[PDB]
C-alpha cells in the first residue's frame, strides 16, 4: 500500500495564459444587402444565436488591463482594412495649379466675414490639346497665400498628392464580434465594482464577446457602454501626473449637432473616365453649424463626478476646470464624424467652473474641414465630396479623458484639462473585462495501483 | 579540508550478524556523498549512490541513510562476501577526498 506507482490521466482541466490570433464574426442581418461600406465586408462568418455562459466557483484570478494584448492587434486590423478599402479610386494629381480667388458677399453675417472664397482656374480636358476655365468655392482652412494681384495655392501641394474618395461608400459603423479558435478560452470577470486591476473571485467563460462599434473621436467618447452603480475613475498610477485618467459615467447625456446650410453639386471631366466633384451654388442665407446640450443635466453630472473624485486627494481641497492648454488644431478641439462629414467644435464653454470644500441650453459653434490626415500619419490625405441637403444627428456622451496639471507643494487645489490624442485609449475603454487562456490536457499523479502484465 | 571520519575503524563479528557503519563529515555537505567497496587486488566500485539511491545490481541487504554530517550503512545479514573495506567519498566542491576506511573481520 505504501509503495506506489505512477499513473497517467487525460483531459485534465488545467490552463495557462498565452497569445494567439483572433477572428471575426458578424450578424447575418448586415449581410442582407448593404454591399457598400468600409467595414462589414462579407468575409466574416455568420454568427449564431442563443449564446451560452458557463459559471465557475471557488476561483480567483488576477487581471491587468494596462499590460494587455489584443488591442494593438485590432488597431492594426482597422488600419489595414481602411487602407484596403481606400485603394481603388481616382487620383487627384493635376489640380496643383495657381488659382484666382475673391470674397463672397451674399448677405453673409458678420461672424463669417472671409470664411468662404470663390476661386477659378484652368484645367485640361480629355483631349490633350485644349484647356478650359472652371470655378468652385472653398473654405479658409484649405487654401494658403504666396508672394496688388491675388493668388492662392493648395495647402498639401508641397507635401503629397492624395486620392479622392469614391462616391458610393458608407462610413456607418455596425456591431462586430470577436471569437477565438478551438483550443482556447475567453474569460470574463463579472464583478460590478472591480477597478480594472487586481484579483477577481467571480469569473465566467464565453466564446464570443458582445457587440463592439468602432468609433473615432477625441476629447470625448460617444455611444459607449453605461456603468451600473456609479461614475467610476480608472488610471495606471493616479499619483503620477504624466498618465491620463479615464472617467466612465453612470447615465447618458444627449447632444444635438446640426448644419442648417444648403448645398448643391456639380461634375467635371478631367480625362478618360476621370470625373471630379465640386461645390455648386448656395441658395439663401448662411449660418454656422452648431451643437446643443442641456444645462441641468451637465450640472448634476459634474457635481456627482466631483463628489466621487474627492475620495483620493482629501476633502479639504479645491477643484478648478480649465479648457485645453493649446497646440495643434487636432487635439485642442473635439473632432467627430456624422453623416460623412467632419466637424471641429470648440469646447471652451464646458470645462469652466470651480468647486470648493463643504430649460436653458448650452450652445457651442463648430467649423468644417475638407482635407483630413487621421491616425497622425504623413503623406496620406483625402478628399470629402460635398453632400446635398441639411444634416442632423443625435448621440450620447458616456465618458471623459482627463489629465492632471502639475502643481507646487500642497496648495490645497488641483486643476485638470482634457487630453487624449492616441486612439489606443478609445479601444482600451471597452476591452478591460476579457482575458484569453490556453488548455493543457495532460496530467500525471501517483497512485497505489500497479499495472498488470 | 573537509575531514571525514569512519567508525568503527575495525570490527570482528560472525557471519549473518546485523552490523552498522557510520561516516561523519566535518561540516554540512547536504547529501552529495557516495559509498564504495573494495577488496585488495580488485578495482574499487560504487556500492551506494547519494546515500539514498540503491545502485543497480547490489544486494538489498545493504541500506544507506542519513544527511548533513552523519551517514549510515546497515547490513541486515552479513555474508562471507561482505568481509571487505568501505570508503565514503564526497562529490562536492574541490578538492576531492576519501575516507579513512573501515574493515570487517571474521571472529
Amino acid at each position: 500500500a505504501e509503495n506506489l506507482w505512477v499513473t497517467v490521466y487525460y483531459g485534465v482541466p488545467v490552463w495557462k495564459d498565452a497569445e494567439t490570433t483572433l477572428f471575426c464574426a458578424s450578424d447575418a442581418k448586415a449581410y442582407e444587402t448593404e454591399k457598400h461600406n468600409v467595414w462589414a465586408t462579407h468575409a466574416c462568418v455568420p454568427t449564431d444565436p442563443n449564446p451560452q455562459e458557463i459559471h465557475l466557483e471557488n476561483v480567483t484570478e488576477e487581471f491587468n488591463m494596462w499590460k494587455n494584448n489584443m488591442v494593438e492587434q485590432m488597431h492594426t486590423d482597422i488600419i489595414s482594412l481602411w487602407d484596403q478599402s481606400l485603394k481603388p479610386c481616382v487620383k487627384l494629381t493635376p489640380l496643383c495649379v495657381t488659382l484666382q480667388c475673391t470674397n463672397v458677399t451674399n448677405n453673409i453675417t458678420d461672424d463669417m466675414r472671409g470664411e468662404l472664397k470663390n476661386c477659378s482656374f484652368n484645367m485640361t480636358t480629355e483631349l490633350r490639346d485644349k484647356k478650359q476655365k472652371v470655378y468652385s468655392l472653398f473654405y479658409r482652412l484649405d487654401v494658403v497665400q504666396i508672394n496688388s494681384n491675388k493668388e492662392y495655392r493648395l495647402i498639401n501641394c508641397n507635401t503629397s498628392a492624395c486620392t479622392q474618395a469614391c462616391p458610393k461608400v458608407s462610413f456607418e459603423p455596425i456591431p462586430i464580434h470577436y471569437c477565438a479558435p478551438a483550443g482556447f478560452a475567453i474569460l470574463k470577470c463579472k464583478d460590478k465594482k472591480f477597478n480594472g486591476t487586481g484579483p477577481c473571485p467571480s469569473v465566467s467563460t464565453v466564446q464570443c464577446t458582445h457587440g463592439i462599434k468602432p468609433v473615432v473621436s477625441t476629447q470625448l467618447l460617444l455611444n459607449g457602454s453605461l456603468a451600473e452603480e456609479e461614475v467610476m475613475i480608472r488610471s495606471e498610477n493616479i499619483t503620477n501626473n504624466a498618465k491620463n485618467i479615464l472617467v466612465q459615467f453612470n447615465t447618458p447625456v444627449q447632444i444635438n449637432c446640426t448644419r442648417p446650410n444648403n448645398n448643391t453639386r456639380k461634375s467635371i471631366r478631367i480625362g478618360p473616365g476621370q470625373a471630379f466633384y465640386a461645390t455648386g451654388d448656395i441658395i439663401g442665407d448662411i449660418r454656422q453649424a452648431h451643437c446643443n446640450v442641456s444645462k441641468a443635466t451637465w450640472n448634476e453630472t459634474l457635481g456627482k463626478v466631483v463628489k466621487q473624485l474627492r475620495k483620493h486627494f482629501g476633502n479639504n481641497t479645491i477643484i478648478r476646470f480649465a479648457n485645453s492648454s493649446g497646440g495643434d488644431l487636432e487635439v485642442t478641439t473635439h473632432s467627430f464624424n456624422c453623416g460623412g462629414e467632419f466637424f471641429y467644435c470648440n469646447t471652451s464653454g464646458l470645462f469652466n467652473s470651480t468647486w470648493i470644500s463643504n430649460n436653458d441650453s448650452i450652445t457651442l459653434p463648430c467649423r468644417i474641414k475638407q482635407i483630413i490626415n487621421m491616425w497622425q500619419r504623413i503623406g496620406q490625405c483625402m478628399y470629402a465630396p460635398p453632400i446635398q441637403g441639411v444634416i442632423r444627428c443625435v448621440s450620447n456622451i458616456t465618458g471623459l479623458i482627463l489629465t492632471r496639471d502639475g502643481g507646487s507643494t500642497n496648495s490645497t487645489t488641483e486643476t485638470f484639462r482634457p487630453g487624449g490624442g492616441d486612439m489606443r485609449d478609445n479601444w482600451r475603454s471597452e476591452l478591460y473585462k476579457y482575458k484569453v487562456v490556453k488548455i493543457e490536457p495532460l496530467g500525471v499523479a501517483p497512485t497505489r495501483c500497479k499495472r498488470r502484465v | 579540508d573537509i575531514q571525514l571520519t569512519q567508525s568503527p575503524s575495525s570490527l570482528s563479528a560472525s557471519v549473518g550478524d546485523r552490523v552498522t557503519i557510520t561516516c561523519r563529515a566535518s561540516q554540512d555537505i547536504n547529501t552529495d556523498l557516495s559509498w564504495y567497496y573494495q577488496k585488495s587486488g580488485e578495482a574499487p566500485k560504487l556500492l551506494i549512490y547519494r546515500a539514498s539511491n540503491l545502485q543497480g545490481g547490489a544486494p538489498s541487504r545493504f541500506s544507506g541513510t542519513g544527511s548533513g554530517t552523519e551517514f549510515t550503512l546497515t547490513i541486515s545479514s552479513l555474508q562471507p562476501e561482505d568481509f571487505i573495506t568501505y570508503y565514503c567519498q564526497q562529490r562536492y566542491s574541490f578538492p576531492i577526498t576519501f575516507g579513512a576506511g573501515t574493515k570487517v573481520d571474521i571472529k
Partner: protein, 132 residues
C-alpha cells in the same frame, strides 16, 4: 412546463473541487478538441495550428503504450525525492493547478522513464513469445 428548466453539464467548470472529484468528469473535455483578402487569411493559420496541436498529443500518448484509453497504469515506481505527502490529503484537499505548480520542476525525467520502461517490456515479451 411551468417550473421545469434545463440543467446541462458544460465546459471546464469543475476546476474548483478536490483533486479526486474532478477526475470523475473528464470525458466531456476530451470531446471538444477538433471542433469544426487579409480579412480571412488568418483562419488557415488557426486551423493548421489546431490540427498540429491535436496530432502532437496523439503521438505522445501513442508512444507511451496507453493509447485508446483515458486511465492507464504503468510500472515506473514513484520516489519520495520528487515530492512528499500521503494519499489521503492529496486526494481529499487539493486542486489540479496547485499540483501543477507543485510538480513543475521534475517533469522531463518523469516523462523519460516511461519509454525505456515500455521498451524493456516489449523486448522481454518478444523473446517470451519467440522462444516457442
Amino acid at each position: 412546463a411551468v417550473g421545469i428548466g434545463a440543467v446541462f453539464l458544460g465546459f471546464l467548470g469543475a476546476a474548483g473541487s478536490t483533486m479526486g472529484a474532478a477526475s470523475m468528469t473528464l470525458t466531456v473535455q476530451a470531446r471538444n478538441l477538433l471542433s469544426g483578402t487579409v480579412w480571412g487569411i488568418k483562419q488557415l493559420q488557426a486551423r493548421v495550428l489546431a490540427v498540429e496541436r491535436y496530432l502532437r498529443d496523439q503521438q505522445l500518448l501513442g508512444i507511451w503504450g496507453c493509447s485508446g484509453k483515458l486511465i492507464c497504469c504503468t510500472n515506473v515506481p514513484w520516489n519520495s525525492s520528487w515530492s512528499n505527502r500521503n494519499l489521503s490529503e492529496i486526494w481529499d484537499n487539493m486542486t489540479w493547478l496547485q499540483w501543477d505548480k507543485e510538480i513543475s520542476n521534475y517533469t522531463q525525467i518523469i516523462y523519460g522513464l516511461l519509454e525505456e520502461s515500455q521498451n524493456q517490456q516489449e523486448k522481454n515479451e518478444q523473446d517470451l513469445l519467440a522462444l516457442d
